[model samples]
Target: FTIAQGKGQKLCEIERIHFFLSKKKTDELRNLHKLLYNRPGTVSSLKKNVGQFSGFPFEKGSVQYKKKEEMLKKFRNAMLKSICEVLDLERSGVNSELVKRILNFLMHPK
Candidate 1:
């Protein structure tokens, strides 16, 4: 199991190098090579560790959580707009549109 885990980790390191993670891919990874591996004792710690692994660089705090909330809201809006085309969301107590205008711009990008 140890050997397999090492092999898997080596594979990931190679992939990261292939994309050049030695450079400043992001602020978190831009720092010195430090071990991020840890054990989350509780839900709060778990969430914080998750953010680190995902390169979000923000824990549950004033600005960070707010940023996360806004991103989630944006994603939800985009998701709703996607389904608005196949479903009559406006009639089903949901206000949404497929945003066909975006398609026009995509086809003839200015």
Candidate 2:
């Protein structure tokens, strides 16, 4: 099952990358609001309020999974384009690393 575990880890890494990028994007939005209205905070209620979907439990190799995967791919591409435009970075790995640096710098203690 070593191969299975390896593939699973790769999938988890993708999820982690998605999560980090999502949080960074959200933080940028929050920073904009803070600049305008001087508001702040994230946690507790934020996660509770983000309860959107119960998840689409489609099994692997199934037709439904294919459809869902296509949909997710489209959504991912759309978000990539948006991030690329807003952040002025190409939708690629180097930019992803740069994004990590940007978030890391912002997260540094003030």
Candidate 3:
């Protein structure tokens, strides 16, 4: 869950990272993202749209930023679906089920 800060990194870079993963990798990445974002400070910071200061920042009022956020959420859900398929979990209701499975797997590893 490393958050990298860079000078030229753009929304596309984040999208690339999000879309580049295979199903298993996507699952792992999404889980890591969730864990990282779940921390008290991270969500506020990310959702803050810090626009170049914060690593994942974007401007809240900008169309590019809003579009990027939509794209990211779509990518995240797509990844979750892919992962569920790979895990042989029911693909329907995957948004809810995936979370349960991920938490359970984390808590009790085989």
Candidate 4:
């Protein structure tokens, strides 16, 4: 989730929400990730529950939810592109596992 913060740089969370609710998810950076939860969840579960996740403003039916879905798709695509095409790694056995992991992250952001 890179944005305008730290020395008025990184977009952080607020700016991300604003941008998603606005425009600028464009140009060369359209493929870049943003508003990512470097750490999400609480307790020992490490999952995305309705718990009071301090780092995220997760309202299930709102723009945050919608944007999160889009972000997950982008992440998945990028992962596949990297491992399958760029890295030229073993994809037949790992891609599905990677997708499952992403889905887990999306459904339970911890």
lDDT score of residue 101 within candidate 3: 43
List RMSD in Å for every model shown. Answer: 16.8, 12.9, 14.4, 14.1
Q: Quantify all predictions' global Cα lDDT against the true fold.
A: 0.30, 0.35, 0.39, 0.36
Per-residue accuracy of model 4 over 52-87 as CA lDDT, tens digit each: 223343235566665656665556667445422322
Clashes of each: 0, 0, 0, 10
Task: Name model 4 segments beyond 4 Å from true.
Answer: 1-57, 79-104
- Supply the TM-score for candidate 4: 0.27
Query: What's the TM-score of every candidate structure?
Result: 0.21, 0.30, 0.26, 0.27
TM-score of decoy 3? 0.26
Model 2 per-residue lDDT tens digits across residues 42-83: 553222212111121113455754554454344345434543
Candidate 2 TM-score, C-alpha based: 0.30
Instruction: State which candidate has the highest lDDT.
Output: 3
Judge candidate 1 against the unseen true structure and give its global Cα lDDT, from 0 to 1. Answer: 0.30
Q: Relative to the unseen true structure, what is the Cα RMSD of model 1?
A: 16.8
Off by over 4 Å in 1: 1-58, 79-110
Of 3 and 4, the candidate ranking higher by lDDT: 3
